[PDB]
């Protein structure tokens, strides 16, 4: 039996030089993302709501206008909830569907349900409207390079529905979309016609973005089997910084620090991690101060920090895909 599922263990990045880094920093526009990808998502969008629908259409429309050969799938399913049976819909955007391996970027597009309080509405700006916009901006910004993909390795984006609990977190009330998708992918032969390999074996790495957008985030290196990739994020941040390609940024206050975090954090990566998928969890610790508060809004977002992370992530993806 082919040993292709092991290729991910030996995969190395094709590192960009100074000139290329300058080009990537120049190619991303934080103001464009702000107006075209983020603001339309800053609305109430808990599962089943009109906003969930509007968000899903926004995300799909923005991917569909790109030149790259994105194949969009809406994975809709039912699940029991504290409010009875309900419908959910994950959004999966895939380049080269039959491609055996894919680097996967992900986040959740639902917003935690909260009844309006004193005319305030919860829109989860950092949680996770920004991660959503960041993935859209990356697809747009790297569009020309991704188009060239039209190593049997390509890219995939997942926007999970129902990451949030309807009440407070519990094993059964939360991670609706990811628990469902992880199970579906684990039982789907891949590539097509395969005898004993699944879509999960095809996942080179799950890079999950969550709670991004607040000032001074510090991301810990959570897992040893993705530690070398965390290292690459550190190196990229360091080099972009040294080249003067980051804004209001210092090494003392770097985002990717030299520290681990032993505990467990409940999030969409769990169902994948427990089935063996390598995970690079881009969630900060501590969480943003506005976490699950009506203040997790646009006003409290740190623009230059988001801009800096767009450059780091875009460089990471290009290097991973050898583009
Ligand atoms: Zn949340």
UniProtKB/Swiss-Prot annotation:
GO terms for cellular component: extracellular exosome; extracellular region; ficolin-1-rich granule lumen; specific granule lumen; tertiary granule lumen. The active site is at 163 (proton acceptor), 210 (proton acceptor). Keywords: Acyltransferase, Disulfide bond, Glycoprotein, Metal-binding, Secreted, Signal, Transferase, Zinc. It catalyses: N-terminal L-glutaminyl-[peptide] = N-terminal 5-oxo-L-prolyl-[peptide] + NH4(+). One of its GO terms (molecular function) is zinc ion binding. Changing residue 163 to D: Reduces activity by about 98%. GO terms for biological process: peptidyl-pyroglutamic acid biosynthetic process, using glutaminyl-peptide cyclotransferase; protein modification process. Changing residue 291 to A: Abolishes activity. Changing residue 112 to A: Lowers activity by approximately 40%. InterPro entries: M28_QC, Peptidase_M28, QC/QCL. Changing residue 287 to A: Greatly lowers activity. It is an enzyme of class 2 (transferase). Disulfide bonds join 107-132. Transmembrane segments: none annotated. It comes from the Eukaryota. Changing residue 128 to G: Reduces activity by 96%. Zn(2+) binds at residues 127, 164, 292. Changing residue 114 to A: Lowers activity by approximately 30%. It is found in: Secreted. Pfam families: Peptidase_M28 (PF04389). The keyword Lyase does not apply. Glycans are attached at residues 17, 258. Belongs to the glutaminyl-peptide cyclotransferase family. Responsible for the biosynthesis of pyroglutamyl peptides. Has a bias against acidic and tryptophan residues adjacent to the N-terminal glutaminyl residue and a lack of importance of chain length after the second residue. Also catalyzes N-terminal pyroglutamate formation. May be involved in the N-terminal pyroglutamate formation of several amyloid-related plaque-forming peptides. This is Glutaminyl-peptide cyclotransferase. The lineage of its organism: Eukaryota, Metazoa, Chordata, Craniata, Vertebrata. The gene is QPCT.
């Amino acid at each position: 039996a082919s040993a292709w599922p092991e290729e991910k263990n030996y995969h190395q990045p094709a590192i960009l030089n100074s000139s290329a880094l300058w080009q990537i920093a120049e190619g991303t526009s934080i103001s464009e993302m702000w107006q075209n990808d983020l603001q339309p998502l800053l609305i109430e969008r808990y599962p089943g709501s009109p906003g969930s629908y509007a968000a899903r259409q926004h995300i799909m429309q923005r991917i569909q206008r790109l030149q790259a050969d994105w194949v969009l799938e809406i994975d809709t399913f039912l699940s029991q909830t504290p409010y009875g049976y309900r419908s959910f819909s994950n959004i999966i955007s895939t380049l080269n569907p039959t491609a055996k391996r894919h680097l996967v970027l992900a986040c959740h597009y639902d917003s935690k349900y909260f009844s309006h309080w004193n005319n305030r509405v919860f829109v989860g700006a950092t949680d996770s409207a920004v991660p959503c916009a960041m993935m859209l901006e990356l697809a747009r910004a790297l569009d020309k390079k991704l188009l060239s993909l039209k190593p049997d390795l390509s890219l995939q984006l997942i926007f999970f529905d129902g990451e949030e609990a309807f009440l407070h977190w519990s094993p059964q009330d939360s991670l609706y979309g990811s628990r469902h998708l992880a199970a579906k992918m684990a039982s789907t032969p891949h590539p097509p016609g395969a005898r004993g390999t699944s879509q999960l074996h095809g996942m080179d790495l799950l890079v999950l973005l969550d709670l991004i957008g607040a000032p001074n985030p510090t991301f810990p290196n959570f897992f040893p089997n993705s530690a070398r990739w965390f290292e690459r994020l550190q190196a990229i941040e360091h080099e972009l910084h040294e080249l003067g390609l980051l804004k209001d940024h210092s090494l003392e206050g770097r985002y990717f620090q030299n520290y681990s975090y032993g505990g467990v954090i409940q999030d969409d990566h769990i169902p994948f991690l427990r089935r063996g998928v390598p995970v690079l969890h881009l969630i900060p610790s501590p969480f943003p101060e506005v976490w699950h508060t009506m203040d997790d809004n646009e006003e409290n977002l740190d623009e230059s920090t988001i801009d800096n992370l767009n450059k780091i992530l875009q460089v990471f993806v290009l290097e991973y895909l050898h583009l």
